[PDB]
Design a protein around this ligand. Structure first.
Ligand SMILES: [Ca+2]
Ligand SMILES: [Ca+2]
Ligand SMILES: [Ca+2]
Ligand SMILES: [Ca+2]
Lengths: 144, 73, 146, 73
């Protein structure tokens, strides 16, 4: 089945870390449209920026938004109507650059979670990918 | 009464209606600027607003489809 | 460290399945307060009911809420001020009974996900448990009974 | 002007205030009907409303603590 992974990583208190969102076993027929939402505790990390990954061929297809007060980041993909760009291979969809709190302590674990209510994947306008598996990730605080 | 796809209630199904559905999925908005926007947004008729309702509205504005699945097609 | 597990299960279209929420490696000093929120796709499953598990010794301490239009279920535990009840051992915190949509097709997989923005665990009113792990669950739609 | 803990804005920190903070954490509400309820609810002063804010308010009402962490100078 298509497998979505939020990468885990580590960093120091006060640092920016980079959390990749990966797609494996992407259908060769293509993903036409998707949304993906991650939650996090904004006392632990906040979003500095979100960067499209190499699976995005044209920026007009990809849209992001994040709300640090409410602890979420969202991304959408909409292939053009002729499917001239389509996600039909495996790789990095996007990366979220998170600022780790200045007050983080060594050994804390901040879970970066997939929100299944706001995440969905489609082969076409009417045909949903209904067996996608979400895998979440963790930011570990390490010592300077 | 409402027109399917016409999420801002202005009487026409336009490219901005698809933008507004994508803004709802992204979390930029929590509601549509129209009394019947949530109903008008659900153009596949599955009962929920999802990213494919936005792409369906876009594809209808672009002339790829001529009616919405909720319209029985 | 404390581990929260959302169990996986399976059932037919139209059925009610149960998803247990288990806590492992609970601190012996006790969890005084927590919130736990799960999301789900509300056109795939909806919550029929939430049942407190054996870790809840008195209903006064446990509160639940779900919204089947928006796709979440939330649970809180607040120990009393004397710590007369406290969660300080491992077991089932709660079980969510989910109705699988009657239009579900065999082979669909529904991710029942821990929401880190709305989930937190405290040893006391000011001291947070800041290394908790979560392991989410899936519901698989099957064709046959059991 | 507001009183820490007084999430319903009625001028007093009471049992129900902690219930209201719990309703927010549960998702039963998305905002407080008091102009200053969000700032009043954040009694640990960390910038987020979380379950321990609700238990802090309850514990103040019950007499376990006599000030909130946001007030300690
Ligand atoms: Ca319109
Ligand atoms: Ca829909
Ligand atoms: Ca009050
Ligand atoms: Ca707080």
């Amino acid at each position: 089945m298509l497998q979505v992974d939020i990468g885990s990583t580590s960093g120091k208190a006060g640092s920016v870390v980079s959390v990749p969102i990966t797609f494996t076993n992407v259908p060769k027929s293509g993903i036409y449209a998707l949304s993906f939402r991650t939650n996090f505790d904004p006392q632990k990390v906040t979003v500095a920026s979100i960067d499209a990954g190499s699976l995005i061929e044209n920026a007009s297809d990809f849209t992001t938004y994040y709300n640090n007060e409410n602890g979420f980041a969202s991304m959408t993909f909409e292939a053009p109507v002729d499917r001239a760009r389509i996600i039909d291979s495996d790789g990095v969809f996007a990366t979220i650059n998170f600022k780790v709190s200045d007050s983080a302590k060594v050994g804390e674990l901040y879970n970066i979670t997939t929100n299944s209510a706001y995440t969905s994947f489609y082969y076409s306008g009417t045909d949903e990918i209904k067996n996608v598996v979400y895998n979440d990730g963790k930011i570990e605080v390490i010592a300077l | 009464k409402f027109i399917y796809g016409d999420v801002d209630g202005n009487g026409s199904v336009r490219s901005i209606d698809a933008v507004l559905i994508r803004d709802y999925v992204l979390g930029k908005i929590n509601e549509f600027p129209y009394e019947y926007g949530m109903l008008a947004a659900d153009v596949d008729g599955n009962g929920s607003i999802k990213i494919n309702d936005a792409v369906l509205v876009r594809d209808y504005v672009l002339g790829k489809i001529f009616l919405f699945p909720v319209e029985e097609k």
